Design a protein around this nucleic acid. Structure first.
Ligand SMILES: [Mg+2]
Ligand SMILES: [Mg+2]
Ligand SMILES: [Mg+2]
Ligand SMILES: [Mg+2]
Lengths: 123, 95, 243, 154, 76
RNA sequence: CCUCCGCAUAAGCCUGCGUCAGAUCACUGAACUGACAAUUAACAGCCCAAUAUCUACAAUCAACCAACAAGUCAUUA
RNA sequence: GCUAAACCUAGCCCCAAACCCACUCCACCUUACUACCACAACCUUAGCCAAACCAUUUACCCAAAUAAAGUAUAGGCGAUA
């Protein structure tokens, strides 16, 4: 006879308490006789770098001078990545409206391991 | 079809007003049922020498039954429209 | 408080800002028009005025239609405009007797038709009225093409109309691919109904259907910004070169 | 760390800095809890806030890079696909998609959902709107009234 | 007397929308917005094949299609 | 001196007499307030590739006998 | 002398004007707020009440304020409309 409390896996009868969980992402499946099969590949792997000889530390010196905040946009990214290559190739006759893929553009995301839309990677 | 009239008169609305109706205005009186009115013939022109109705180019009045169910489906006859009527006069005049 | 616009206007008012705004003009005009159907279940008053036998004074009259209910099965056929009449009656045609609920339903018949333009055999549920109108119009095609939306009273009637008008517009060769001259004859028979193609697209369409169609046309995969910036950059470079 | 400072930093280096910030956070979080247990004040509690902010900043910086690149490649503003839909309560929602193995027409659970409003809902939409209007009208009035008393006092 | 009563069997699918019959045009269906609505027409979907093999979700060949199928009946 | 009660599971409830500090039929305290702790899976829940195909003979110590109301439990390619 | 008493401002009401919000990440129609597998919507309002009972009947928003006019008209020609 309570409506206002949050509904949880603690709360039902036996069957109910089995079915619901907390938020944890499942990492396998079940087979006959309730045997759990784990898939190694479904388990997230921590991609953790080498920290040896690394100068950056978690806090910053106050002695550092202040600079104006300017966020990143597509326009300026194009200007400081693609634009110099394009204009340099515009000077000669190497540039082409077709096959501009040389500059880093891709027609499709289908083949890629890291597909941008829809996103297929974690963080 | 069924044709009805109201028991109660409806007050006038004027030109640009939709009439105001009441629970009383829903009461109807049966005028006539269309299905009970006597039979009428359908005018046709025959394209073929069909049995006991006539021959090609004849203007014939026949029952709606025979017309819609025998004559028109099989293309034995055509509608006696003004457009095709004149056409059948033309082919006759060619003689 | 008060709403700015009366509530009855909202249906109209909403057509002006969304997806309905960018719908074609001709479709919106066909949606707007409010013309009355022809009488089916009531004998209309002949004249605008009539003398009262009561007092001998000439009085104005109006034609007030009976409200007609159309069950959804009616959309899957061609009823000439006959619907269910739901009303009340007095028991023995005396007002002093008991009042009772009455429903008058039309008689229905399953009948076979051939459409010349569509070159297709159909089997539809119809009334005697419809059969009579077809006879007077001198064929199914003529009946479908002549009769406005209101009088047809059928989604399926409108769909037949849409097809036929599209076929006339396109001068479709698949009417008779093997027999070209017969195709020519069938076209010139129904030449007076012929309208433009892009207008014929939208005939006999409900608003929900319309907005699906419009949404389908306007929806596009968005252009990568790589193309935009590369186009404009070579433009700036073009003007730079011509200096 | 400032967002600007982190933007100057390399892509790979941000990834490395981010674990440096991770370990630092956990230390301070365990230190928070131990103070709480001993019923003692924390040594420098504000450190935690700083650390958190730095990582917020870092995440934002990285996010920006991904977002930028998406625009240049696909022209999509949102990473995850979705649609404007109409729930049964007749209100307009941004429905986010999920991933499935099978196509939608074959999905029994998905087809159970109603992404449309039947007509009975329209009256409620009216009442809801009216309610919103009332609240708004009330707000406006109070604004004006308050200015009035503020004029008589000054 | 046939076995299995009518109610128990899988229901015969509802009759097709009349728009589909008319040879001139293609219907407007709710294929476009990826959910059912009552007012647009029911789309007809092409039969689906999972491109890759998945052991848990496997459908066996029809009986003629098996390599070991023989007209002569063995009794085991 | 009493015990037809107890211990456990289920069903229901949701931290509801653990520790520490203030605080208030009965302690100036506790089944009050605040802060801190805790309940670790082997028990239990959460299952199963497909298409055909198989499945006449109760239970009762299942033996003898005895019935009637005619019965909870199987596969093979 | 206790118990008390006293307070002005949160806000709200009716107008006018003007056509409104639908919203970081995650989740949410299965037992909602739960990552992850082969049916479908449209269908006369009734009644209290008035008639000093009650049985035909009994005002209810439809798109310009005023006036025409409680007029023509309707009605167990009555209540009333
Ligand atoms: Mg007037
Ligand atoms: Mg176990
Ligand atoms: Mg009375
Ligand atoms: Mg009284």
């Amino acid at each position: 006879a309570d409506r206002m409390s949050k509904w949880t896996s603690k709360r039902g009868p036996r069957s109910f308490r089995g079915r619901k969980g907390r938020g944890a992402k499942g990492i396998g499946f079940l087979t006959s006789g309730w045997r759990f099969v784990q898939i190694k590949e479904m388990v997230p792997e921590f991609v953790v770098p080498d920290l040896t000889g690394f100068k950056l530390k978690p806090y910053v010196s106050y002695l550092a001078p202040e600079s104006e905040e300017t966020p990143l946009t597509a326009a300026q990214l194009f200007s400081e990545a693609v634009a110099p290559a394009i204009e340099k190739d515009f000077k000669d006759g190497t540039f082409d409206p077709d096959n501009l893929e040389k500059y880093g553009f891709e027609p499709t995301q289908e083949g890629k391991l890291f597909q941008l839309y829809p996103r297929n990677f974690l963080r | 079809t069924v044709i009805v009239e109201r028991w109660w008169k409806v007050p006038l609305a004027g030109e640009g007003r939709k009439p105001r109706l009441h629970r009383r205005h829903r009461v109807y009186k049966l005028v006539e049922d269309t299905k009970h009115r006597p039979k009428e013939n359908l005018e046709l022109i025959l394209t073929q020498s069909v049995e006991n109705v006539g021959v090609r180019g004849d203007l014939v009045s026949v029952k709606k039954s025979l017309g819609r169910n025998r004559l028109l489906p099989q293309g034995l006859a055509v509608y006696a429209s003004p457009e095709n009527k004149k056409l059948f006069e033309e082919e006759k005049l060619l003689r | 408080p008060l709403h700015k616009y009366p509530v009855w206007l909202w249906k109209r008012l909403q057509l002006r800002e969304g997806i309905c705004s960018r719908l074609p003009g001709h479709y919106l005009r066909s949606l707007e028009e409010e013309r009355t159907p022809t009488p089916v279940h009531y004998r209309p008053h002949g004249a605008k005025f009539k003398i009262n036998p009561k007092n001998g004074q000439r009085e104005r009259v109006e034609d007030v239609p009976i409200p007609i209910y159309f069950p959804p099965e009616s959309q899957r056929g061609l009823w000439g405009g006959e619907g269910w009449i739901l009303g009340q009656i007095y028991a023995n045609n005396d007002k002093l007797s008991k009042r009772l609920k009455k429903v008058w339903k039309p008689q229905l018949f399953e009948r076979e038709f051939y459409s010349e333009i569509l070159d297709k055999k159909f089997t539809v549920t119809v009334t005697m009225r419809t059969l009579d109108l077809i006879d007077e119009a001198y064929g199914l095609d003529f009946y479908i093409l002549k009769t406005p939306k209101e009088d047809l009273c059928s989604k399926f009637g409108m769909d037949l109309k849409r097809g036929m008008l599209l076929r006339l517009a396109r001068q479709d060769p698949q009417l008779h691919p093997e027999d070209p001259e017969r195709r020519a004859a069938i076209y010139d028979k129904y030449k007076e109904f012929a309208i433009p193609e892009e207008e014929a697209e939208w005939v006999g369409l409900t608003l929900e259907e319309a907005i699906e169609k419009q949404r389908l046309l306007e929806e596009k995969d968005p252009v990568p910004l790589f193309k935009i910036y590369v186009a404009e950059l070579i433009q700036q470079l073009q003007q730079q070169a011509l200096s | 760390w400032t967002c600007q400072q982190l933007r100057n930093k390399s892509n790979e280096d941000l990834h490395k800095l981010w674990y440096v910030l991770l370990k630092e956070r956990n230390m301070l979080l365990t230190l928070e809890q131990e103070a709480k247990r001993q019923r003692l004040p924390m040594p420098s509690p504000e450190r935690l806030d700083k650390v958190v902010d730095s990582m917020d900043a870092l995440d934002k910086v990285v996010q920006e890079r991904e977002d930028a690149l998406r625009l240049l490649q696909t022209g999509q503003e949102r990473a995850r696909p979705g649609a404007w839909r109409r729930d049964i309560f007749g209100r307009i929602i941004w429905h986010k998609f999920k991933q499935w193995v099978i196509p939608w027409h074959l999905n029994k659970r998905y087809n159970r959902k109603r992404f449309f409003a039947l007509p009975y809902v329209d009256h409620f939409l009216r009442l809801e709107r009216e309610k919103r209007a009332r609240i708004k009208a009330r707000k406006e009035n109070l604004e004006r009234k308050k200015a009035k008393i503020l004029l008589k006092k000054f | 007397y046939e076995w299995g009563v009518r109610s128990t069997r899988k229901s015969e699918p509802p009759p097709l929308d009349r728009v589909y019959e008319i040879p001139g045009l293609e219907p407007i269906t709710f294929a476009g917005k990826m959910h059912f609505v009552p007012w647009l027409a029911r789309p007809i979907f092409p039969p689906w094949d999972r491109g890759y093999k998945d052991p848990r979700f496997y459908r066996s060949p029809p009986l003629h299609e098996h390599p070991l199928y023989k007209d002569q009946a063995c009794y085991i």
